[PDB]
Amino acid sequence: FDRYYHEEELESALREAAAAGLARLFSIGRSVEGRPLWVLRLTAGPLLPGRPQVKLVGNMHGDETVSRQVLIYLARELAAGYRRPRLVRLLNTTDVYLLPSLNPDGFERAREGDCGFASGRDNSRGRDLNRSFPDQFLDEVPEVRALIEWIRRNKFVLSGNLHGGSVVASYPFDDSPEHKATGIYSKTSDDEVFKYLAKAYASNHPIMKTGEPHCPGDEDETFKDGITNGAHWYDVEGGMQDYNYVWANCFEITLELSCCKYPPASQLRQEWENNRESLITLIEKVHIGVKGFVENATISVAGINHNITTGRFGDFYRLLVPGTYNLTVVLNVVVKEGPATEVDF
Amino acid sequence: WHCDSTWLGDRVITTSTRTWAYNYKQISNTNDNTYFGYSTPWGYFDFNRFHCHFSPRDWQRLINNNWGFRPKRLSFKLVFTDSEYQLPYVLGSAHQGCLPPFPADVFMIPQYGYLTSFYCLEYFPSFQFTYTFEDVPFHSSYAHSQSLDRLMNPLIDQYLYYLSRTQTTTQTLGFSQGGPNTMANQAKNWLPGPCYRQQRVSTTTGQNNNSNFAWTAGTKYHNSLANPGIAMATHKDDEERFFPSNGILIFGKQNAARDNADYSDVMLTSEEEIKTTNPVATEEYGIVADNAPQIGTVNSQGALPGMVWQNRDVYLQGPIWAKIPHTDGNFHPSPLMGGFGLKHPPPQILGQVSVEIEWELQKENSKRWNPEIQYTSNYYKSTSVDFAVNTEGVYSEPRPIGTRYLTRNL
Amino acid sequence: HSQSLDRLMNPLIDQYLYYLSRTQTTNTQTLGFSQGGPNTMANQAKNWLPGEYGIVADNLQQQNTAPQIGTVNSQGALPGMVWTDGNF
Amino acid sequence: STRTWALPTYNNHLYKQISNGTSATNDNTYFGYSTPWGYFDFNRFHCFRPKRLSFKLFNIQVKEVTQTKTIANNLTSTIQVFTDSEYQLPYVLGSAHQGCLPPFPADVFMIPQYGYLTLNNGSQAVGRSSFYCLEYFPSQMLRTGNNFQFTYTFEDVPFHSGPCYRQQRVSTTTNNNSNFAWTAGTKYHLNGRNSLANPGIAMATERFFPSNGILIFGKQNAARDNADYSDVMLTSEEGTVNSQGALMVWQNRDVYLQGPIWAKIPHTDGNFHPSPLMGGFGLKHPPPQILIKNTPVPADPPTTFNQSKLNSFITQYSTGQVSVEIEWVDFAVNEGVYSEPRPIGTR
Amino acid sequence: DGVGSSSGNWHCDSTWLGDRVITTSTRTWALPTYNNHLYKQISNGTSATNDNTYFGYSTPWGYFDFNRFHCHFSPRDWQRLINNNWGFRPKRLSFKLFNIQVKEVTQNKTIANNLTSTIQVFTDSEYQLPYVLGSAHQGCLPPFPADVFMIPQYGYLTLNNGSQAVGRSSFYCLEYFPSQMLRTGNNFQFTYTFEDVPFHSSYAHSQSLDRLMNPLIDQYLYYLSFSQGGPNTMANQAKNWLPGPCYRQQRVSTTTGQNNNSNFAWTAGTKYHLNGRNSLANPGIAMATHKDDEERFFPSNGILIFGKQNAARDNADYSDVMLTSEEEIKTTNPVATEEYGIVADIGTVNSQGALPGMVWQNRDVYLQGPIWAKIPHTDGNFHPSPLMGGFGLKHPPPQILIKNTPVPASKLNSFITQYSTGQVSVEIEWELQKENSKRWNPEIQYTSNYYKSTSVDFAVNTEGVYSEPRPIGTRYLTRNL
Amino acid sequence: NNHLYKQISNGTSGATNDNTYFGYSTPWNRFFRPDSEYQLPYVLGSAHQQYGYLTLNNGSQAVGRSSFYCLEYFPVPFHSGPCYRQQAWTAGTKYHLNGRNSLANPGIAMSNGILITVNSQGALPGMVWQNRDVYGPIWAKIPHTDGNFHPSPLMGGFGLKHPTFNQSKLN
Amino acid sequence: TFEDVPFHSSYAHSQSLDRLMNPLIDQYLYYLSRTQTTANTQTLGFSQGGPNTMANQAKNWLPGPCMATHKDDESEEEIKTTNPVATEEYGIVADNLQQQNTAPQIGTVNSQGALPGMVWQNRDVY
């Protein structure tokens, strides 16, 4: 390791990860400077039935670069594991989309060892990619528009944003109706599932198992169980996780890995050790809730005001915490810890 | 229409021209908010804010290279002015209706009213006039390079002993000479300024108490809040998230609500530059004895001999002067909001209006080797330029520009 | 004196300075700021202090300790107050 | 008064940043610079109101030390002397430091080293921290035949002849059986840092004395620290309101033959009765501090050019006579050591 | 005068009188004996590449050189200068050499005063000697007044054919000049008056060259689109001026991962050819270091790269050097990395000479950078401003040559080992350009970092070593085109 | 602008990077030889048919060096060779400045070269040339730069170095 | 009477334009000495121009526009100190913009116009 991947080195790393294992490398668009947004599909091309889509988007902010490296390493490790059980099953039952960098321009503009505590956080136009999404409360951000089109073109059910500047797992509704900076806890219809996903990701991390991050700037942000709500943490107008929850049916969680946004490459291996398990767990947490088939049909659960839509082949993946739920189709079901309960319509 | 500024040596002539455009009613009204007074049908001209005469570039050019400044005279061109100071002085109360910071803005004249003595304003002889400021001390537009407790030589011991031990390591009496390693115990010549302890409120709203203590826990005097009270440091080192509950000047961002303004909609002024002499507002002045020995934490400390304190900083948006009340006696007649306490302030003047003020500057002669701290605009690109009109045409002040940027020795 | 020390401002024009008006919502923590005006004239910013004298803070409040207050029964000279080798 | 002074090379002709952090206590943390300059201090009375002063610096000899050890005359060596008449340097006088002129004229004293303190955040420095290069001042150079002179006229100040900040009583006849010297001491708070209020405001002090509210002098041959009561010299100043501000008449602290003469009133927006708390005359423009330094005389530089600054100098020290003239058996040698038996007050 | 009387005082401060700033600085200097009082023919030939071949003479004389801005301006003085003035230029300097003392060293190492020894000091007021000043060499007066500095040895180069000399090669014996001889009690002094030189631009333009138009009124002239140049089609508008001349430089990224994996520092570097001897165009013509949002990139050899305190002479890492950025001249000067423009045949022009209507800014001066350079006495020259920045002077301050007089212990070659030391005081008066800007918003001013740091910037560390952490530029105020 | 100063910015959001601008529109030279202090941007001489000015920009954004000017804050040789070879926009002769290809219209006097092998050769000793004819702008302001070569306006002409109360504002 | 002619220079320079520096003192100005760590990888090394690396030193001036008849050992031979040789290139410039893959391409300047800091001599008379 001990090396960052730059222009045409990210593409080369993804190509060698594909060769290590299966993998399809493509681009969902281009950045402001025309730098392609590389996406690696592990399973462009047709959408296979029965495969719950998982997309892992990192490096939203250019200075946040642990995400890029851990995404590359995760793709390589998944390819090697499939080539060599757990990873084989994960790649056989789950379609995993790996997007190492949504802001390659900012990553190039980022500097060595700044750590966060001008910097490349925004794209080439100075617009934050995390502040350029529609919120329930373009043409200047081609990466954001490209990702919006990519989400609209697919049916992602679980997703993970990897960030920097903190060590925490934030779940959706990063903004609030009153738009107060902190304090206000914005609860979603699927808040329990988001909490379960954030807890599952944070438990495996050797740092987020304790809510306190031990890094400059806060020194006292003792997150409960290593997870937090975005609005409860700090308000973000037009975030992407809230968009993915509202305008899409995806369950998208932000994951701040380290408080040093751009660590020296020597730390990368260590950071990999801090995430290798966690990322995999997150992906293998998409097999929860219920799964089944019914064709652009609305699927709803009683007691929750959030309705999902079946995919092109009628496949729906309703992520849920274990329990008994009343499923409804518009055009008692038991959930247990483990594989999704199969219900047909 | 002059609206110019000329820098000639130690003088600066700041003139500003603005375009300007009611009802006697017996007005009256918790027991602490009751009032009685009269609403006159007169409008009054107010220019008691620094931005009414100084542009942001002028303010930078003033605070970056001058240790002090004070007004000398003003010419006002346009109705009467109370030159003999008969009417109640409503200026200096940090009220609105002042000349707009942006010369292109058209403002309306605020209505004049007073509180109680009935004053009929048509009982006065009712355009241009000139006023000359009385000799007022220079505003300390500087920070102190040294703290009050670090004015000694860090290499030489003191010849004065301090009682360092009272018990053998039985009880005894031991004395030691104050030195570099025991600076806290060295004999000193001066004490920090007076303290009127205030409640600490964190900008991180999570750390604050889950109660509405904005008024109940306030630092009111007998019940009106001591806002901002005596000049004290806003916070100590690495505590910029804290501020006294009502011990700082808080300005309004553009389009900020009159009430229920969120923390993002207001601009807090930090008086930390005076922490070298003034005790932190949210912390105690010190510890005195009470009687096993007993120690009492003194919170409100009055004036003591040897005390030295800095006044509250003035700001581009802050008030310029305030009338010293015609009382029998006073202690350090300086406005608590900051500015120049004038026994005979500019008379309140009860189309276009031009006001020019001559300010005498104190050119700094500092032999400090390293570069100073100057006020600068962020080089990084922004959606809109700071201190400039936006797309809609609304001129806004993004931050409250302080005044103490150069440094000085105590 | 025909007018009081805390009532020498305009009773028609509100101030441009903000004061901390509320900290708890109407209940969680918040930070509300209001402009002192004709109605809330006790909270208006003043330039001078009187020559119990007043109420001061007695501790550092936090999310666990309520801020208690101290009644000042003897107040010495302070800047802005209006009413041998040295004398006052 | 004329005294013989010796001045060595300080910091080896270097400006050394000095600092102490907690990694000690926060109350003792400091940041500053130690300069190669010494300074002339005559702020003690043994070195009414002052009117003026004349200051002379003559009979200067600069001597080389060669290592056996031999000391030889250096006729061409100079010394740099300047007074900060504009008070642009941190005024370290008035803190009652050692190194002043000896009370006995026959005694030869070493010039105290001049260092200053500045703003700090623990052991680290803040942006407001200032660095003063004393070579950045116009300073007169003196050889063996040159002499320095300057006259300073004192500003008007009241002749040297109430509020309380209660102290903790201590009995000379040894008091509680605990170490209450600092925990129970009357302190004040500044920037989250507790500083001992020594000696505090002028208040009355026979066995009783305030814990830190009096000036304590040192007997001849007294320990630097942990000195016994027999080795020190106590000065006598002969709803419960424990601290009272201005409301009221009072008297200033008495000045002593061993005590300071004057102190600099800090350049501040306001001050209440700016009389120094250790006694003396508070001066807005005090006698400027005289800074003196042996001019660095380098040893032989290399034959080939080297960009790095010279770090090898000949060992030099300058002695001379300093005369200060201010217009306004007990106390005798024993072994020939001058001793001051009891502190003398002017009241 | 005399052995035991000081020959001068330590004058080192700055005085600001309106539009004038007089900066005087005194330093302690130590001049050794160079070459054992011998003139040595030095040379490098191919048998070393042909580009590095030289022929010249090394003289026993040292030379005083105060051609760096930090020799006279303190960092606070520099901040005063660049935060308040649109321009500055030297007016006159006074140079003094005093408290001279010559010491002889004897080895058995004992150093003793030699009262009767003299030193020879002279100034080439007629510029008859080769001018080695302005070449940005070490040996300047230290930025810190407390630093005692070595006097650099004086040598010169002449025409060469490889390591050999030619008929036109000139040998300059510095003893042939009338030099004032000084004992311990003597002092040297002279006054030089700077010739009329344009003010240095201590400002960065508020307007780019292509954005001088009214963004609301369409042009009355047409361009072959036909259309009138307007706000939306702002790049097609007819314009009065062209950017400055260009000489394309290779782009290098400070983020080393983005650079090519080759040792292109020399082969790909921008060079000029002279007498078959390729030389590096360092720092080349004044061009913008990088365009917008490209601060990581820099021209390969088109910038001034200063050295941090205690930095290696060779193979110094990027952390040990401070890169100057000429991004303040993006408004008029073309970017040093990419091409000047496109012509038709189309073809991109990488090097563009002077064209009518072209306007450009000179290279910025820095606190550690050179102050002046001597314009070569040539028939033709174009915009004679030094390429490292500063002031191009036909008659620069004369170089002061100082040498210990040999004391003997065929020609005599046994001399007693001597070295002199003393004080050098240089005082330069600069005429300031007061700024009269009706700009409303505040601009960029040079300020020190507020946040706490281990040591103060532009101050000594714990070990007593004065360091300059960053290269302070000069263009912080703004002036519209 | 209804007595208002309006910020005007045009980024790449249709328009390309070469057409981006930032400036302010304030509410406030056509045919031998022929704000007094020149403290405002001199939009004259750009051959226009309301006063508004431009400043430094990075796309639609404005860098900190951008200057905002409030206008209420106010009280040559006789007119009679170098080559920059000419040829609509892709093949047109342009010059590069801060990553922005600006059309070289009308360029130096000799596609976009009129008012409506060596291709580019700079100044050489002994070279003689004539300025563009006038028809057309009388003059233009020479930008205040340290250096300029033949500071004659390429568009033609003469190069002159000095050619109940409410707090809310009423609207 | 003749006008103010520029006083034709009937001399020959004794110093070349690229050898105007002191051959004994290093330059305080650094230059990019190398970019590849001598498997080789990428770095950024800087070196000070000195007596040995003379061609890499920083210099204030440039040779005249692209003139000397010939270089050494091959008539305007007297002006080769300042003017470039008439029968070769003016200098070496950057042709492309490098990347990870795009090795830097190089351009030979044959005709160079006037540049700032450029000095030159005039042809001799006979």
- Could you say which of E316, E338, E358 is where a domain stops? E358
Q: Which residues of D51-89 are buried (b: 16+ CB within 10 A; e: fewer)?
A: eebebbbeebbbbbeeeeeeeeebbbbbbbbbbbeeebb
- Are C34 and C57 in a shared domain? no
How many domains would you assign to chain D? 2
Smallest CA–CA distance from B302 into chain C, residue: C76
- In sequence order, which ranges of chain A are alpha helices (DSSP H)? 9-20, 66-83, 86-93, 104-109, 142-152, 191-204, 230-233, 240-246, 266-284
Rounded to a whole number, what is the distance in Å from the CA of F167 to chain E's nearest CA?
22
Contact assignment for B229 to C22 by CB distance below 8 Å: no
Ramachandran angles phi, psi of E29, nearest 5°: -120, 150
- Compute CA distances D347 → A166, D251, D255, E393, whole Å: 67, 11, 9, 72
CB-count exposure of residue D114 (10 Å: 0-12, 13-18, 19+): buried
C82 touches chain F (CB under 8 A): no
What distance in Å separates the CA atoms of residue E467 and residue E310, rounded to the nearest whole number? 9
C40 with C62, same domain? no
* CA distances for A193 relative to A154, A187, A242, A315, E7, angstroms: 21, 11, 14, 19, 87
CA-to-CA distance for A37 and E147, rounded, in angstroms?
A: 55
Q: State whether C2 and C37 are in the same domain.
A: yes
Same domain, yes or no, for B86 and B53? yes
CATH 2.130.10.10 is the classification of domain A290-342: no
Structure tokens, A292: 């089944």
Round to the nearest angstrom and report the end-to-end CA distance of chain E. Answer: 57
CATH value at residue D9:
2.170.30.10
Q: Is A306 annotated as a binding residue?
A: no
The reply to whether F155 falls in a domain is no
Give yes or no: residues C40 and C6 share one domain: yes
- φ and ψ at residue A126, rounded to 5 degrees: 80, 5
Q: Are E416 and E410 in contact (CB under 8 A)?
A: no
Q: What is the 3-state secondary structure (H, E, C) of chain E?
A: CCCCCCCCCECCEEEEECCEEEEEEEEEEEECCCCCCCCEEEEECCCCCHHHCEEEEEEEEEEECCCEHHHCCCHHHHHHHHHHEEEEEEEEEEEEEEEEEEEEEECCCEEEECCCCCEEEEECCCCCCCCCCCCCECCCCCCCCCCCEECCEEEEEECEECCEECCCCCCCCHHHCCCEEECCCCCEEEEEECCCCCCEECEEECCCCCCCCCCCCCECCEECCCEECCCCCHHHCCCCCECCCEECCCEEECCHHHCCCCCCCCCCCCEEEECCEEEECCCCCCCECCCCCCCCEEECCCCCEEECCCCCCCCECHHHEEECCCHHHCCCCCECCCCCEEECCCEEECEECCCCCEEECCCCCCCCCECEEECCCCCEEECCCCCCCCEEECCCCCCEEEEECCCECCCCCCECCEEEEEEEEEEEEEEEEECCCCECCCCCCCCCCCCCECCCCCCECCCCCECCCCCCCCCCEEECC
The Cα–Cα gap between B210 and C27 comes to 8
A118/chain E closest Cα distance in angstroms: 8
Continuous H helices in chain F: none
Closest CA relative to residue F30, chosen from F170, F157, F132, F167 = F157
Grouping H, G, I as helix, E, B as strand and the rest as coil, residue A87 is: helix
In this complex, is the C-beta atom of B204 within 8 Å of any C-beta atom belonging to chain C?
Answer: no
Question: Cα separation of B315 and B342, whole Å?
Answer: 18
Q: In angstroms, rounded to a whole number, what is the distance separating the alpha carbons of residues A132 and A144? A: 7
CA trace torsion B251, B257, B259, B261 (10° rounding): -70
Report d(CA E278, CA E271) in Å as an integer. Answer: 6
Tell me if G58 sits within 8 A of E282, measured CB to CB: yes
Contact A255, A161 (CB under 8 A): yes
Q: How far is residue A242's CA from residue A254's CA, in Å, rounded to a whole number?
A: 10
Percent helix / strand / coil, chain D, rounded to 5:
5, 40, 60
Give the residue on G whose Cα is nearest the Cα of F84: G113
Query: What whole-number distance in Å separates Cα of residue D257 and Cα of residue D277?
Result: 16
Helix (H) / strand (E) containing B140: strand B139-140
Shortest alpha-carbon distance between residue F14 and chain A (Å): 9
Is residue E361 within 8 A of residue E479, CB to CB? The reply is no
CA distances for A96 relative to A23, A279, A321, angstroms: 10, 11, 22
Structure tokens at B107: 């403002």
* Token duo for residue A91: 């790649």
CA E3 to chain centre: 38
How many angstroms separate the CA atoms of E443 and B112, rounded? 39
Record the tokens describing residue B323, joined without a space: 């009338």
Buried/exposed code over G38-61 (b: 16+ C-beta within 10 A; e: otherwise)? eeeebbbbbbbbbbebbbbbbbbb
CATH number of A9-284: 3.40.630.10
Q: For residue E440, what are the CA distances in angstroms to B71, B393, E328, E434, F1?
A: 22, 15, 20, 17, 19
Question: Which residues, 6+ apart, have CB-to-CB distance to A161 below 8 Å?
Answer: A57, A58, A60, A240, A241, A252, A253, A254, A255
Q: Say if CB A128 and CB A121 are below 8 A apart.
A: yes
Answer yes or no: is B55 within a domain: yes
Domain around C8: 1-46
Residues E345 and E380 reside in one and the same domain:
no
* G28: closest chain D residue by CA: D307
Report chain A residues whose CB lies below 8 A from the CB of F61.
125-126
- Asked whether A319 and A158 are in contact (CB, 8 A), the reply is yes
- C-alpha to C-alpha distance for C70 and G101, rounded to whole angstroms: 73
- Beta-ladder partners of A299: A308, A329
Enter the DSSP assignment of B32. Answer: G
D18 beta partners: D32
Distance CA E283, CA E136 (A): 12
Nearest to B312 by CA among B264, B249, B363: B249
On whether both G89 and G109 belong to a single domain, the answer is yes
Instruction: Please check whether residue E462 touches B, CB under 8 A.
Output: no
C-alpha distance from E187 to closest chain G C-alpha (Å): 27
Task: Classify B407 as helix, strand or coil.
Answer: strand
Q: Select the residue from A108, A111, A268 to test the E interface by mutation, using most E Cβ atoms within 10 A.
A: A108
Give dist(CA A44, CA A54) in Å, integer: 15
CB contact under 8 A, G31 and E386: no
Residue F75: CA count within 13 A, CB half-sphere = 8
CA distance B242 to B235: 6
Residues G70 and G115 in one domain: yes
Answer yes or no: do C14 and C40 share one domain: yes
CB atoms within 10 A of CB E167: 6
Is G91's Cβ below 8 Å from some Cβ in E? yes
Q: Is C16 on the interface with F (CB under 8 A)?
A: yes
Which residues of B line the annotated binding site? Answer: 334, 341
Q: How many Å lie between the alpha carbon of A5 and the closest alpha carbon of chain G?
A: 11
Domain boundary among E218, E239, E260: E239
Active site residues of A: 256
Count Cβ atoms below 10 Å from residue D223 Cβ, excluding itself: 16
H or E segment to which residue F8 belongs: strand F6-10
What 3-state class would DSSP assign to C55?
strand
Determination technique for this entry: cryo-EM
Domain presence at residue B42: yes
Task: Give me B179's structure tokens.
Answer: 């030195």
- From chain D residues 46-65, the ones with a CB under 8 A of any chain E CB are 64
Q: For the CA atoms of chain E, what is the radius of gyration?
A: 26
Whether chain C lies against chain E with 3 or more Cβ pairs closer than 8 A is no
Query: CA–CA separation, B174 vs D228, rounded Å?
Result: 5
The answer as to whether F167 is a domain residue is: no
User: Can you tell me the distance from the alpha carbon of C53 to that of C7, in angstroms, rounded to the nearest whole number?
Assistant: 17
Integer-rounded Cα Rg, in Å, for chain C is: 17
Please give the Cα distance from B337 to C48 (Å, whole number). Answer: 9
Alpha-carbon torsion, ordered E171, E173, E176, E181, to 10 deg:
160
With CA atoms as reference, the chain F residue closest to G112 would be F122
Which one of B52, B389, B391 would you mutate to disrupt binding with F, by most F Cβ within 10 Å of its Cβ? Answer: B389
Alpha helices in B34-83 (DSSP H): 56-63
Contact predicate B339/B314, CB 8 Å: yes
Strands (E), chain A: 23-30, 36-42, 53-58, 95-99, 158-164, 168-171, 227-229, 251-258, 290-292, 298-301, 308-309, 316-318, 323-325, 327-330, 333-335, 341-342
The bridge status of strand E20-31 relative to strand E149-150 is parallel
**Which residues on chain G place their C-beta less than 8 Å from a C-beta of chain A?**
99-101
> How many helices (H) and strands (E) in chain F?
0, 10
Residues of C in contact with A187 (CB under 8 A): none
Whether F and A touch, i.e. at least 3 CB pairs below 8 A, reads as: yes
DSSP-derived secondary structure letter, C12: S
Q: Is residue C87 part of a domain?
A: no
Query: Between helices A266-284 and A86-93, what is the axis angle to 10°?
Result: 60
Residue in B334, E286, B190, B163 with CA at minimum distance from that of residue D278: B190
Domain annotation covers residue F132: no
Return residues 277-316 of D near G (CB < 8 Å). 305, 307
Torsion, CA E136, CA E140, CA E145, CA E146, rounded to 10 = 120
CA angle in degrees (0–180, nearest 5) for D256-D323-D137: 100
Closest residue in chain E to residue A105, using alpha carbons only = E293
Contacts of D70 (CB under 8 A, 6+ apart): none
**What does the alpha-carbon distance between residue B86 and residue B119 come to, in Å, rounded to a whole number?**
9
Chains F and E touching, counted as 3 or more CB pairs less than 8 Å apart: yes
Neighbours of chain A (3+ CB pairs under 8 A): B, C, E, F, G
d(CA E358, CA F148): 6
Judge if D146 and D217 occupy the same domain.
Answer: no
Query: Which residues, 6 or more positions from F145, have their beta carbon under 8 angstroms from its beta carbon?
Result: E201, E332, E359, E360, E361, E481
Indicate left, alpha or beta for B65 from its phi (over 0: left) and psi (-120 to 50: alpha). alpha
Torsion sign, CA atoms E35, E41, E46, E52: positive
Q: What is the largest CA-CA distance in chain A?
A: 55
The DSSP string of G41-73 is -EEEEEEE--SSSGGGS--S-BPPP--BS--TT
Q: Which residues of B351-383 are buried (b: 16+ CB within 10 A; e: fewer)?
A: eebbbbbbbbbbebebbbbbbbbbbbbeeebbe
| Domain-embedded: residue E59 | yes
- Do G54 and G113 belong together in one domain? no
Asked whether residue C7 falls in the same domain as residue C39, the answer is yes
The C-alpha torsion from D234 through D235 and D237 to D240, rounded to 10°, is: -40
Residue E113 lies in a domain: yes
Nearest alpha-carbon partner for D79 in D161, D186, D7: D7
Residue in the block written with tokens 């085109």: E481
Whether D248 and chain C come into contact, CB under 8 Å, resolves to yes
The secondary structure of residue F48, as a DSSP letter, is B
Q: Are strands B139-140 and D16-20 parallel, antiparallel or unpaired?
A: unpaired
Cα E375 to Cα E394: distance, rounded to the nearest angstrom = 5
How far is residue B17's CA from residue B13's CA, in Å, rounded to a whole number? 13
Indicate the SS3 state at residue C23: strand
